[PDB]
Amino acid sequence: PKISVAFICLGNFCRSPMAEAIFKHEVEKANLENRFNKIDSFGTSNYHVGESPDHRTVSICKQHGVKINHKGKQIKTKHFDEYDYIIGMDESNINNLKKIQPEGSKAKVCLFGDWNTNDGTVQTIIEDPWYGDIQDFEYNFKQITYFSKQFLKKEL
DSSP states (O other), rough: OOOOEEEESSSSSSHHHHHHHHHHHHHHHHTGGGGEEEEEEEESSSSTTTTOOOOOHHHHHTTOOOOOOOOOBBBBTTHHHOOSSSESSHHHHHHOOOOOOOOTTTEEEEEEEGOOOTSSSSSSSOOOOOSSOOOHHHHHHHHHHHHHHHHHHOOO
């Protein structure tokens, strides 16, 4: 009846925590909270488990008035039966997810950008901003906001 969504990136450090925060935020804005059960973010690696997000991810969120509070956690096979949508940021995320995904598990694995439009507003792939600069985080924010809206528009 209610749906559960998980966002995934490589280290659950720069991108997916941002996707989770922005998505929770848009759901609020639109009064769709009743339609959701769980909204989380995980990383495929365990390198930043227990850590708070990249300070640039937090700064950008704060800059747009988006609340963010998260500690890194790693996706586990059990999660494939707990979420309706497991959303990756780039193709390498998707490759790893499809490999660990139990056959017959419930989760639909997709690229956040599968909800992108065919018009050039934003690039489809949400690129890793770690080696980039604050400008890359700002663009990730713009991308995620846009796909969050398309998702709410087309999936409910």
